[PDB]
Amino acid sequence: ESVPVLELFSNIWGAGTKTAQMWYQQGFRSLEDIRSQASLTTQQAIGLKHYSDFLERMPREEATEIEQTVQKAAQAFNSGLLCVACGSYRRGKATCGDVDVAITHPDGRSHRGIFSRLLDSLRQEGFLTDDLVSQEENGQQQKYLGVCRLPGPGRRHRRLDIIVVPYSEFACALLYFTGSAHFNRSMRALAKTKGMSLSEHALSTAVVRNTHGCKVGPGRVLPTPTEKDVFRLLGLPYREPAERDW
DNA sequence: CAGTAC
DNA sequence: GTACTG
Ligand SMILES: [Mg+2]
Numbered sequence: 001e002s003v004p005v006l007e008l009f010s011n012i013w014g015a016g017t018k019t020a021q022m023w024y025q026q027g028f029r030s031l032e033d034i035r036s037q038a039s040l041t042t043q044q045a046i047g048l049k050h051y052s053d054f055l056e057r058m059p060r061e062e063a064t065e066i067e068q069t070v071q072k073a074a075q076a077f078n079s080g081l082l083c084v085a086c087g088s089y090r091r092g093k094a095t096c097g098d099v100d101v102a103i104t105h106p107d108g109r110s111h112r113g114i115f116s117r118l119l120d121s122l123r124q125e126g127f128l129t130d131d132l133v134s135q136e137e138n139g140q141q142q143k144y145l146g147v148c149r150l151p152g153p154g155r156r157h158r159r160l161d162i163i164v165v166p167y168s169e170f171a172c173a174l175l176y177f178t179g180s181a182h183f184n185r186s187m188r189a190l191a192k193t194k195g196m197s198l199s200e201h202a203l204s205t206a207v208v209r210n211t212h213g214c215k216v217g218p219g220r221v222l223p224t225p226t227e228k229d230v231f232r233l234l235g236l237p238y239r240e241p242a243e244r245d246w
Numbered sequence: 247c248a249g250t251a252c
Numbered sequence: 253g254t255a256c257t258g
Pocket of ligand 1: 009010012
């Protein structure tokens with residue numbers, strides 16, 4: 001029963017096979033064992049108390065409600081703010097393991113200062129229940145990983161990610177968050193072949209690489225207003241989100 | 247490293 | 253593949 005036990009532990013958020021193997025050696029076999037005796041990060045502690053809820057997929061309708069709960073609270077600061085859900089949701093899946101929401105503003109300035117106030121707003125509402133990786137202040141983008149829950153009876157806690165980008169990077173951001181994961185690797189593995197690089201920030205050309213293929217030059221950023229431009233500059237037929245489910 | 251996001 | 257914090 002070792003293999004089932006490792007799986008049991010691995011389904012905790014913030015716990016992988018290394019920690020599960022450690023917990024197993026300590027003699028833990030149940031979630032209760034982990035809760036009473038094991039040393040936990042705040043993350044792992046949160047994932048342990050939402051273990052059941054976090055295992056469930058959600059109907060995309062509930063995902064929609066979550067996107068609007070974020071969009072409303074966002075536009076309460078600036079009406080011109082854009083909020084797009086880019087998970088399994090954008091790819092059209094009937095179910096979502098989590099909700100991923102991208103946020104930007106067309107003017108390219110008003111996105112600033114929103115991140116902290118938006119999270120604060122959601123917390124007051126009682127929408128955001130716990131924070132995991134409460135922070136990322138990467139470049140011009142910001143990322144939040146957290147736990148939300150819709151108001152009402154019989155509601156499960158859901159995993160919620162929020163990212164905020166400048167409009168100039170909105171295309172590469174949507175691409176990255178929309179996925180899929182295997183699609184992103186494929187696309188970026190390919191750009192690498194063409195002497196280019198792809199990230200959530202920008203598509204770049206003239207990326208220097210050495211004989212080993214290691215990147216030693218960052219190259220230069222190509223302006224990509226929309227997703228379709230990124231596909232074009234990479235010599236690829238544009239794929240709709242539903243065609244990116246690899 | 248380990249775990250995570252796509 | 254790229255890239256973040258625990
Ligand atoms: Mg896990």
